[PDB]
């Protein structure tokens, strides 16, 4: 093969590898975002349940 | 010039790897926080059942 074909192939391989790395970063980002959402929901539930516990204590 | 390009390449690679490691640590710390929040939620469910039972 010519030098230009070899240049194209090394460039394509490099860019494919770069894309895979970017995909891994994006997957980590999505995991962190879903965990953040779950944390906010768990905190909301904890706060509400503190209110429910107070209601039962005052009813007793 | 090629040697200089390779050194610049490797320094940038090290910075990127460090960033990836920090993201991994952030995700693991969130995992720890989630498990703690679930444990606290379960304990508080027990407390609510105890108060309802006392009533």
From Swiss-Prot, chain B:
Coiled coil feature spans: 7-53
Disruption-associated phenotype: TMEM266-deficient mice show no significant difference in rota-rod test and gait analysis but show a significant reduction in stereotypic behaviors.
Subcellular location per the Swiss-Prot or TrEMBL entry: Cell projection, Dendrite; Perikaryon
Domain of life, per lineage: Eukaryota
Phenotype upon changing residue 27 to A: Loss of homodimerization
Domain notes for this protein: The transmembrane segment S4 functions as a voltage-sensor and is characterized by a series of positively charged amino acids at every third position. Transplantation of the transmembrane segment S4 into HVCN1, generates a functional voltage-activated proton channel.
Function description: Voltage-sensor protein present on the post-synaptic side of glutamatergic mossy fibers and granule cells in the cerebellum. Despite the presence of a voltage-sensor segment, does not form a functional ion channel and its precise role remains unclear. Undergoes both rapid and slow structural rearrangements in response to changes in voltage. Contains a zinc-binding site that can regulate the slow conformational transition.
Protein name (record): Transmembrane protein 266
Residue window of the full protein shown: 226 to 280 of 538
